[PDB]
Symmetry: C4
Subunit: 263 residues, 4 copies
């Protein structure tokens, strides 16, 4: 029976039908936004929602028997899995956050549609090279968050009270969000020199972001000229000393013609 | 009189003419902006408008004969068609919003000037390949919109009472416009963890844009290496398939001295 | 024998002296900020400005005499000229707002030095390639100013009442400055769909500013690849043509042992 | 005795120990941020600072011994040194920024981890290039800062009262941080034409930042594209001086078959 289900999971009808259920379920996810619509139709869509989660788990289990292990070595399939698992947690209780994370299920449309995975893939690819810089930055934030909390916390607690208080505030400053009328000018009333802290924080952070981008584009170029030079260097050494194997059978031949002297 | 009017339409004069009207009428739409002006000279401009609109209509008509079905397959003409059609909906009456849409007819200066035509064309060219990602972002927005609305709308209706509402705010946050003192910190007095929503949102949004920009730059400079490489790659073969061919000649010239075979 | 003075205007010391001046006067421009200073040393320093300003006048005259018409085809000169002419107009005058422009004479430091000049010159060079887009965009503003004025100027005259008013505001919205909480959201409390005007506006202008940067970088690299292959090909071709010079005299003296028999 | 110490100092145990010490010390410094923690465990903390501060003074000395004057011509070491100094000075004194500047010793984790000082390097490496542009802009600011102080400082003393205050506001404007509603929009009430100063300032300032990027990127690439030229032209160079070097012997195996006229 294994091959019998495998023909299904792999059909064009399967993926389209699941893509189809993703999409319209998405539309219902959106209609539950309206409190008006939720009245005249609430039980309809929650029903619908239960049908979709059913079909999805059906599907996901099928996919597992058809792919087992390979399935769990697949980033994309793990996603659908966890994102479906979440939806499978009951419409209940105090930790009511999960009712809302059920709208993550719509990200299946990203898994289900190949054009889109490529985009997500292309995006993630940039990340691992950056993990070093991310560390350095987070270190830099940490160190400055500490100083903030200490230098500024007592008189300005909404902003620099806790450690995490200052983290949030320093993120805002980085996005240059209302940074000067909004935070530093207040600070400077008590502590006139605050700028000696915030002006450098701004230049370093902005500096790094910008440059990091420059480096990315330019280093990527550097490897493109690499493969190109290779490809062309590979040519002058494919030719030339293949025109060497022919200018020495001039040589072998030229000296094959050297008992002109015997006569 | 097909050929007689084709001659007029296609002439340099006609085009220079329509352009000149476009400039005057655009100068006068700026003057129509002054309440002070209309009281003194406003009689003059409601007919100037009413006859430039008339002249333009005539033109659009002519041009249609002169190109028939091919006129309605030209982007630039189709524009002129609509942008002048909208200016025909009554001098008053209908709705007064189509009287504001009237001023759009100055974009006919972009349409009727071929430096502008291509400059716009240049700009539009990067879009159709972007389309996929525009969809991915839109889905991202929309999921988050659904999410923000049922997390912050009951308590913060101004910002999150509706999908549309939350679509707006999330756009605001994307442009980083007064996002933290302006939306999130208030949200956070009622909901201390709002940062776990919006900071992830900010990264994704921002990360996608920037990398999108890198990709365009970085991929375009790839294609340029392609055509340069094969330009160069072809030209070594032209001057190195030339070499080994006239050493084949020399190799043979040596085997011309087979005439040692005379003995 | 005017040439005498010509050798002095051109001298290393003529230029180096004027730069000492431009820097000095520039250090006094700053201290004329401290009203603390400008009582205790006001007279002391107003002369310094009077000396400097006459010297520069002299300098400009000499440069003129030396370079004649060719002086007025030189922007760097033309600038020096106007920025000094400006400073000439007395003070009190008709309006203490040309007294302010006087400061602009410090940019003479950009003039007096290369490197500085190269860089200014460097930056400007992208501009002429841009005159077209700058115009399309200006048309784009103009059009949306006219539209914004007449759509919102009635109830929002501070932001959109006058044509120039709408220009200023659309400029602010372009820099995304307090655009939503400070402008559109207020607008929408009277005119709900006003987002249909501002979101597209922001998209258009943002898109244009980014692409233009992308076009500059990539079209730059294309010109850089034109030059590259032509240096590589003009190499490959020429040597490859090096190789056929040693082939024809390894050829037509393989014809003398052939003519041998 | 040198080489015995030298081999300890260069040990990866030495390095890893100091790195470890750097890291746990960083963990305690965030703990000092809590007022709860400092109550219940603050004495545990303040001695560990002493410990680490000693150990590092030891570490720095062992290293000066090992490297002699080579140590003092090393930026990363100079830093490690200068940062340990600050942490040395007795707690309090009259000004207690030093009891805060002490959290800079965490930056040692940068100098200590070889992968981090690499990216700081790459970053720093861009600066020398732009020291001229910097000067240009620093002047430009100065000039505009003088100009605004004496145009808006009497009536707007907070923003423009002194030179210093004008530098701060112009920097605020440069970052485009709340510029219009805030500074510029108020100013224009008193001085209507103030847009004539803050639009130019903004164009110039943002143009120059933005182009400056373009110049790095594109000139970086011009250099990249040239090292490619050499590598390619070098192979060509090689073949056509080095095979005429070894068929110059084939150039004289043809005069031998000539020369055999003689008797
Ligand atoms: C929505 C948005 C931004 C924005 O509107 O902030 C104003 C930027 N700015 C002048 C400026 C920038 C830096 C230091 C000093 C001054 C600007 C904006 C519009 C027109 C002209 C200039 C800024 C930005 C600023 C700060 C933080 C972040 N973040 O974490 O995503 C983004 C950037 P960026 O990479 O910034 C750099 C330039 C050359 C402008 C290109 O884009 C993007 C990608 N996102
Ligand atoms: O007015 P509502 O409550 O029906 O919701 C309006 C939304 O924009 C449509 O879903
Ligand atoms: O305090 P003042 O009056 O001496 O002026 C301070 C300025 O920042 C010095 O140039
Ligand atoms: O009435 P105004 O002030 O908009 O005048 C029109 C000009 O374009 C700007 O002054
Ligand atoms: O305020 P505390 O003492 O509970 O600590 C909160 C900080 O973010 C944790 O160090
Ligand atoms: Ca802002
Ligand atoms: Ca703001």
């Amino acid at each position: 029976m294994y091959l019998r289900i495998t023909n299904i999971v792999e059909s064009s009808f399967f993926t389209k039908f699941i893509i189809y259920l993703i999409v319209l379920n998405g539309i219902t996810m959106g209609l539950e936004t309206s409190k008006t619509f939720m009245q005249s139709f609430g039980v309809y869509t929650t029903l619908f929602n239960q049908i979709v989660i059913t079909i999805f788990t059906i599907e996901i289990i099928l996919r597992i028997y058809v792919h087992r292990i390979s399935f769990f070595k697949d980033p994309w399939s793990l996603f659908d899995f966890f994102v479906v698992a979440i939806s499978l947690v009951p419409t209940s209780s105090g930790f009511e956050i999960l009712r809302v994370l059920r709208v993550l299920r719509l990200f299946r449309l990203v898994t289900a549609v190949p054009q889109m995975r490529k985009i997500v893939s292309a995006l993630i690819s940039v990340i691992p090279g950056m993990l070093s810089v991310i560390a350095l930055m987070t270190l830099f934030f940490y160190i400055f968050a500490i100083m903030a909390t200490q230098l500024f916390g007592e008189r300005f607690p909404e902003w620099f009270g806790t450690l995490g208080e200052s983290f949030y505030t320093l993120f805002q400053v980085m996005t240059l969000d209302d940074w000067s009328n909004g935070i530093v000018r207040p600070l400077m009333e008590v502590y006139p020199y605050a700028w000696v802290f915030f002006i450098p924080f701004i230049f370093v952070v902005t500096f790094v972001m910008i440059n990091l981008v420059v480096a990315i584009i330019v280093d990527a170029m550097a490897i493109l000229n690499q493969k190109e030079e290779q490809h062309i260097i590979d040519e002058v050494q494919s030719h030339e000393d293949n025109i060497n194997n022919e200018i020495i059978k001039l040589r072998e031949e030229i000296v094959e013609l050297k008992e002109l002297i015997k006569t």
